[PDB]
Amino acid sequence: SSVLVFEISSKMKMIEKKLEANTVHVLRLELDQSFILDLTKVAAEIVDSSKYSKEDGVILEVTVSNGRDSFLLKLPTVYPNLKLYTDGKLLNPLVEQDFHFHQNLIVTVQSRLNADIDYRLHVTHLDRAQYDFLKFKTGQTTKTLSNQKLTFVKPIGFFLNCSEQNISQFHVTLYSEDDICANLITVPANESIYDRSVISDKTHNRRVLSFTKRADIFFTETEISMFKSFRIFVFIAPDDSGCSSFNEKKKISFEFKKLENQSYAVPTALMMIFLTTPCLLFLPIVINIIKNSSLHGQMLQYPVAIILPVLMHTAIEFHKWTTSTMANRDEMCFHNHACARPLGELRAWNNIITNIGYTLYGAIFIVLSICRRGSHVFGTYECTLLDVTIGVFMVLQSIASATYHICPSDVAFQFDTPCIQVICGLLMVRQWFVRHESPSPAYTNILLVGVVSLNFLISAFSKTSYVRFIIAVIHVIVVGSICLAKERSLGSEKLKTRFFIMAFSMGNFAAIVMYLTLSAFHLNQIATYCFIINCIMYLMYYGCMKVLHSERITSKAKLCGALSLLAWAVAGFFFFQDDTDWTRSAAASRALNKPCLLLGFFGSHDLWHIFGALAGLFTFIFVSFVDDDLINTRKTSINIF
Amino acid sequence: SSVLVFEISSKMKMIEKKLEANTVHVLRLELDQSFILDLTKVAAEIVDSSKYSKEDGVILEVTVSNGRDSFLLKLPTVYPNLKLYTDGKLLNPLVEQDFHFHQNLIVTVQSRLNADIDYRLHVTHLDRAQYDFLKFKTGQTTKTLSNQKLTFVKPIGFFLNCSEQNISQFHVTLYSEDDICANLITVPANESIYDRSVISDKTHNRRVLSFTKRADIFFTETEISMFKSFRIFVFIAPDDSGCSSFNEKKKISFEFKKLENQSYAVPTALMMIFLTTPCLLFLPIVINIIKNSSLHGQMLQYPVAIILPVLMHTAIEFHKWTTSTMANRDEMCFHNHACARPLGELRAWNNIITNIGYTLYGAIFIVLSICRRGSHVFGTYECTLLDVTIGVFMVLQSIASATYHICPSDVAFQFDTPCIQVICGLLMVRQWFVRHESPSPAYTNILLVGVVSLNFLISAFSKTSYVRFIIAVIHVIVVGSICLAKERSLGSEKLKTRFFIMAFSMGNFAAIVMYLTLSAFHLNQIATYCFIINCIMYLMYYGCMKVLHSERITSKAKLCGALSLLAWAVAGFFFFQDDTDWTRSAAASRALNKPCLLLGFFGSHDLWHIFGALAGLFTFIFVSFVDDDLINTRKTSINIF
Ligand SMILES: CCCCCCCC/C=C\CCCCCCCC(=O)O[C@@H](COC(=O)CCCCCCCCCCCCCCC)COP(=O)([O-])OCC[N+](C)(C)C
Ligand SMILES: CCCCCCCC/C=C\CCCCCCCC(=O)O[C@@H](COC(=O)CCCCCCCCCCCCCCC)COP(=O)([O-])OCC[N+](C)(C)C
Ligand SMILES: CC(C)CCC[C@@H](C)[C@H]1CC[C@H]2[C@@H]3CC=C4C[C@@H](O)CC[C@]4(C)[C@H]3CC[C@]12C
Ligand SMILES: CC(C)CCC[C@@H](C)[C@H]1CC[C@H]2[C@@H]3CC=C4C[C@@H](O)CC[C@]4(C)[C@H]3CC[C@]12C
Ligand SMILES: CC(C)CCC[C@@H](C)[C@H]1CC[C@H]2[C@@H]3CC=C4C[C@@H](O)CC[C@]4(C)[C@H]3CC[C@]12C
Ligand SMILES: CC(C)CCC[C@@H](C)[C@H]1CC[C@H]2[C@@H]3CC=C4C[C@@H](O)CC[C@]4(C)[C@H]3CC[C@]12C
Ligand SMILES: CC(C)CCC[C@@H](C)[C@H]1CC[C@H]2[C@@H]3CC=C4C[C@@H](O)CC[C@]4(C)[C@H]3CC[C@]12C
Ligand SMILES: CC(C)CCC[C@@H](C)[C@H]1CC[C@H]2[C@@H]3CC=C4C[C@@H](O)CC[C@]4(C)[C@H]3CC[C@]12C
Ligand SMILES: CC(C)CCC[C@@H](C)[C@H]1CC[C@H]2[C@@H]3CC=C4C[C@@H](O)CC[C@]4(C)[C@H]3CC[C@]12C
Ligand SMILES: CC(C)CCC[C@@H](C)[C@H]1CC[C@H]2[C@@H]3CC=C4C[C@@H](O)CC[C@]4(C)[C@H]3CC[C@]12C
Ligand SMILES: [Zn+2]
Ligand SMILES: [Zn+2]
């Protein structure tokens, strides 16, 4: 007797049986040709689980197999928080080639306990119109499934065949209104979501994406070429592990898109045209002077190690991106997929190509500074090398930001806007030293070390509850030191020094009060905002000093100052829309849903890139032009401030 | 009829049966109390597999279960290279708590083919004296198993219970003489080597180590505290995937050690005593002069960004080490485990603490240079800031090498000996400029950029077959440029310039010939050897120039030069023993078996650290002392070379 064979009718949805001690139940269901493409779920439940609360390990084992696919159920399934005494798994359906020939569904029940167990078997079939949904007609590139129910007892599965449907690139988006944790699972059609193929695998081809409100997966050309067929599953997650008592019903809307390679010619051309016409301010003055007109002692003492942090970070990020599998790239990278336009394997090509303004303006800065060089009695001190450094850091900002947008994740060094802080500090150094000497680029050494150290410190303490107090202390110390240096350099000449100190203290204290007690300022924005505000304040102080020392600001310099102020404000408005936070769960990071503002290509972050580049350009032009009224004044009669 | 039940005797080892089309075989074996702790293997074989060469997917499915554990067999199992029609898996044995009560072993056979299949079942029991071997008596800390057979049909498994055996720290070593690929697998005793627990796991607690000649796993205190029980398996690997036709027999010897926390007081004290007594050369001269005896203008223009590459690499490595699981740390890190002494979670504490000589000597360099400062008419030009830079890079070398030995892997930047190259270049700069001016530390900028770029370039092209030609081209270009600079600076004064150029060309060409056509020079050593050799050649040239210009080298400086030459040679001899190569397989990297040379604590690499630090110290002292015969000579009458 130990082995008991039962015959189960197809109509049966629920089976209740008692497993006598040391006995095995074998249940058979015959499958005809009506079971083709029928995705079946079999679940097992232990009746009266309270009696087995003192037993460790597996209390019931169930095996399910239809001949083509199989899995094992081990009850209870244990989770970090809970223990479930009911669980089930999906069986890959039989195909038309499988079919008086018939197929069998076999269920085996075993236990290690020397006591009778009551148990329940649930055989549920999924909606065969959510399976095989992914079939595209001629001229059809998008399909939508709206208001689909998701339950712990009824998951959702799709079959995708790219070879048969003529698909080279595929995108999938899920939308939900509730905050119920779910999972999006993808495997190649010949892989199992439950088992390992062999015991040495170390192959990562399975995607597991926890989500609440939004999930995105992109099948690139390379991945489709490798595998050609995929299965997609959605499950209710029993434990809110990657997101933050069940019986929830969760509604999900799907969006499936076939994609082709796209050359975003119109948006790129419009961006280049918009970025180019600002450069016409360089033509009438800087270039015309060039038209009208030891190097090794500065080439080997120029600080070139300032480029090392960005270049090493770029090498590290490229190494991390290239060795990752296709499946892991959708798990580890976080984009704003509502405004992400792909190009090849790159998920957000807009966020990368919109950094070209920094590259264009940095090279222009370098070339113009080198050419404009060339006298020692009249005018302010020239600033060739530090302007070259400002251009170099513009180029470094373009490289660092483009590298960041390949795969935005939580790493040791964020590196999306530190070069902007360096640029602001360098402009402050320029205006601080231009009337005493030729400004040196070793203040770049000190500034870069400070900026990178602050970036790392903010990153390391972000999870804690006192990181902003550390930032406020460092901010206070830096501003106090700068005020002390101003005092010592100029002396306590009432009008000049005292108002500078008071205004800088008030502005920085207002900022400190703001980001300490607002919570609308994210950690990734505080340092950049502080550097920009301090740079603008110092430039305004320099201009007011020029005015009240009875000097004249040229109308060209007033125009450039106004344009710089406007561009900085617009860039800051678009920067405020960032909303990036690595302290929340992956599902919360995936819930970002801001669409592209312009031409379906440009979003808030893309515009922040372009307008930050413009603000940098206009500020550079303003500081280049502001002291052009003193070109014939003698260096000994030039006022000092 | 479709379900057929068979009763199988315990004596049966082989079963041959025909699976008629659309039929299911259920085989039962009753288990008495004699099956306690009996690790059982069940394998399935498809007879005449040639008939199913045109069929895709799974042709036979087998489920095995003893009530407590279960698995699934799907035939054929496919591998990157081969397809196996015979495969089996291990079943976790029944325990004493499981036991007229009896247990059952159940085997189910199914197929999707509408044709009869012949198949064979093999039920093999493993050696129950290799299972439960890990039981330690009182006063016993090591156990050894010698000459154990490993076959594709008979794997090896061990059960480890740390709670019952009173184990806080455990080490396992495997030795083999043949090059047959195998796998070492470890899981917590409540985890499966075959299945995922739930479908959202992303938990890495399973170790898979490919090996040929040696494998090591270390159970730290933290891991044992989390899990308390583990199962260890060895398998023949069907495909030589992580290593480089079967029926091989592979012999393996095991070594199991209980470990306790150790304070290596005697070796550390001896190392500190050995490192300290060299410093007595500083006492009679440099410190006695201090006893007998703008800063902000150099503090803000000092290049501090030179510390950024090492500090950022250290932050990245610490982030990578801390977020890794216990299981992954044994998979991703490669030590010389024959000479690795643990401390806490650190696998090789000797390789980390032996870098303290660099830290001790760099701080001494900095302090002595700062204090010895302080005149402008007599003697050679003083070198305070560049000596401070040399000390700073000594400290950076200690940090970088200690960080490297936490987890030696194949990363973008190796960073075990670039700071040594920087130190050699800085000494060359010191001797190049000391008789013309005070040497500047911006040559550090150019030198550091070059060194880091060369390191990255060697790393990126290591897999290719022409990396050494790229290195040779860069070497030729650098040496030619240096010779040209020497010519231009000194002029073609026959005796001085021509012999310098000829000797440097000959030495560097000999080196280039060597590492191009020897293959005993590894990629990771070429640049370091070149920098050391060029530094020594330039110091010898400087000394010979002093001698042939009728100047005198003090006996103290001759002693320091001799000690520097001896220490560099000893350090190079120990450096030659490195044998690190990231182009080979992981098994080949794990086959390293060099034991500790001294006190069971110091190996070749540990001695390379100490003697490289000594060589640096002696070279620094020599260049500090060599021009002490010119202290009263006037700067205008000092010879130039
Ligand atoms: C470890 C964690 C990170 C730590 C660092 C974190 C911060 C990193 C940032 C910066 C690090 C460096 C800042 C400067 C340091 C003081 C230098 C100084 O005052 O002396 C110089 C002043 O020269 C200037 O002040 C020039 C302009 C500097 C602007 C750079 C900071 C911008 C403020 C950012 C806003 C706040 C930051 C936002 C915070 C959220 C020279 O003085 P002197 O006496 O004229 O020179 C002698 C010559 N003389 C006597 C003949 C004239
Ligand atoms: C992209 C891939 C990596 C590329 C970089 C890879 C290499 C990176 C390494 C180094 C990069 C920098 C090297 C120096 C470059 C030339 C500088 C020069 O000649 O001019 C200076 C010479 O001054 C010296 O030569 C000082 C000593 C320099 C030693 C540093 C290199 C050691 C050789 C390593 C052995 C070979 C390397 C081993 C290869 C396996 C100054 O010249 P001057 O004219 O006196 O100054 C003007 C003032 N005066 C006219 C008034 C006097
Ligand atoms: C020169 C200035 C404006 C900056 C460089 C921008 C130009 C040269 C870049 C930016 C966008 C680029 C294109 C982006 C997309 C396409 C389509 C596809 O086939 C890949 C390459 C191709 C054809 C690129 C060619 C080069 C390209 C046009
Ligand atoms: C400087 C300002 C005024 C204009 C600069 C010209 C820019 C906008 C031009 C120069 C080269 C051009 C590209 C040349 C080639 C490609 C690839 C092609 O498959 C689609 C068009 C596309 C993508 C063009 C886009 C526009 C482009 C980038
Ligand atoms: C921030 C940078 C880029 C822009 C600088 C803009 C310059 C041109 C602006 C900004 C602040 C301005 C000053 C603000 C207030 C006053 C007081 C009053 O007496 C009128 C002139 C005067 C003194 C302004 C002169 C022009 C001024 C200095
Ligand atoms: C020249 C710049 C850098 C200095 C001042 C920055 C200004 C322009 C920025 C910084 C903070 C920004 C504000 C932050 C919050 C709000 C509230 C909400 O309605 C969104 C926009 C709005 C109203 C922003 C408008 C622009 C803003 C005021
Ligand atoms: C001061 C100079 C010589 C360098 C510093 C070396 C000394 C201070 C270091 C190096 C080795 C270190 C010890 C290494 C091992 C032990 C045993 C264990 O309980 C952890 C800490 C402890 C107790 C450390 C204490 C500090 C220690 C003794
Ligand atoms: C400078 C030379 C001459 C001697 C320097 C003294 C060194 C060797 C001394 C100073 C502090 C000492 C350590 C102090 C504390 C510890 C932890 C203890 O559990 C074992 C001994 C151990 C690990 C000592 C090892 C030797 C030690 C590192
Ligand atoms: C490499 C550094 C650290 C050590 C330098 C060692 C010095 C003291 C050594 C190394 C090479 C030596 C020279 C080698 C050969 C000769 C030729 C002959 O006429 C004797 C003296 C003379 C000229 C030696 C003088 C001392 C010398 C300059
Ligand atoms: C002062 C230093 C840096 C310059 C010269 C380095 C010398 C001392 C080093 C570099 C290469 C080394 C040799 C490399 C290979 C061999 C062959 C084998 O039997 C091991 C040791 C031996 C014999 C080494 C002895 C020491 C050695 C000759
Ligand atoms: Zn950005
Ligand atoms: Zn080392």
Residue numbers in the entry:
A (entry chain A), B (entry chain B): 33 to 131, 144 to 288, 295 to 343, 425 to 505, 510 to 776
Please share excerpts from the published article on this structure.
To achieve a better understanding of cSID1 recognition by dsRNA, we determined the cryo-EM structures of the apo-cSID1 and its complex with a 50-bp dsRNA. The apo-cSID1, cSID1-dsRNA without symmetry (C1), and cSID1-dsRNA with C2 symmetry (C2) structures were determined at overall resolutions of 2.21, 2.35 and 2.21 Å, respectively. The 2.21 Å EM maps display excellent main chain connectivity and side chain densities of cSID1. In addition, two cholesterol-shaped lipids were inserted into the hydrophobic cleft formed by transmembrane helix (TM) 9 and TM10. Another two cholesterol-shaped lipids were positioned adjacent to the TM1 and TM3. Intriguingly, a POPC-shaped lipid was buried into the hydrophobic cavity formed by TM6-9. Interestingly, a POPC-shaped lipid was discovered in the hydrophobic cavity formed by TM6–9 and two cholesterol-shaped lipids were buried into the hydrophobic cleft formed by TM9–TM10 in this study, raising the possibility that POPC and cholesterol play significant roles in controlling the lipid hydrolytic activity of cSID1. Compared to the structure of apo-cSID1, three regions in the binding interfaces display dramatical conformational alterations whereas other regions of cSID1 remain unchanged. The cSID1 exhibits no conformational changes upon binding dsRNA, with the exception of a few binding surfaces.
